Design a protein around this ligand. Sequence first.
Ligand code: ZN
Ligand code: ZN
Length: 331
Amino acid sequence: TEFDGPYVITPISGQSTAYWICDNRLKTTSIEKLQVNRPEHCGDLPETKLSSEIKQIMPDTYLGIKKVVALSDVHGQYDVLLTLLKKQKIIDSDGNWAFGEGHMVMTGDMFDRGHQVNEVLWFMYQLDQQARDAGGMVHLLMGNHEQMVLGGDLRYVHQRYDIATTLINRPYNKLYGADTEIGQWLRSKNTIIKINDVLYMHGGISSEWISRELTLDKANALYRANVDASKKSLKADDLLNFLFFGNGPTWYRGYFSETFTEAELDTILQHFNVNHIVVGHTSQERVLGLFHNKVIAVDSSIKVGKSGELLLLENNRLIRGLYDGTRETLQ
Ligand SMILES: [Zn+2]
Ligand SMILES: [Zn+2]
């Protein structure tokens, strides 16, 4: 049988309510002053204190950040994420943020394929709040699977979540709908950000972005306002169509094409006045650089459920952080 959740409903006024799947049955609890507490007989599903701060919209451009860590495409593999962050000493063994005033960029795709999606989400919500408390930040970016799940494209959701949708009687997209805590938190997030001289997004930026004279702020605001729209309306708008489909920031795989050129990459770098672009989405066997490290791939195949790696940007170095805790300088 399954243990899964919580799924928290947070109304515009009043207390929230938590839904728990416990031994393939539903338990529902009223939340008392922001403490999300697990009912009896329900495994050790995560408990969280709700936070309003981390659902506030934050800037998408940052200056002077001394150290950054980036990783991506966890795809519901909590055990792997936790071990990697423990090995690399980003968290303490208790799982609490230990990275000080550093910034973490998770470049999308927390959802789908894996069987520990809510463990990943509540862990990242906790880390988001703890980072802020320490003067640092977690940037949870939206990947193509965040967009798919929130929008109702449920092709890649693990079978186990059929228990939650049946018992709670909501389709999976509405288990993360706008009246849910996690759905509100996600709807506050950015899709493309810039930290120092590095640009971060899930898939990559195509030359079409330039043609369309887009900006970070305009794209991130449109992503927030439309992640809820139908495919037909997305399809219908020329710019939303670009943003949400295959040549856009969350699906583009062009940097990984054997025909893509450094020349074209250089025009993108020049456009954004950056020296590097950090992307997930296209899975690699390790964190690696392309084009003389102008692109760093940080989808390290955590989705396979065995291991993963991260990128550290600190002291003007680019460092590969391995699953065993070791480090190798990329640049
Ligand atoms: Zn992915
Ligand atoms: Zn992806």
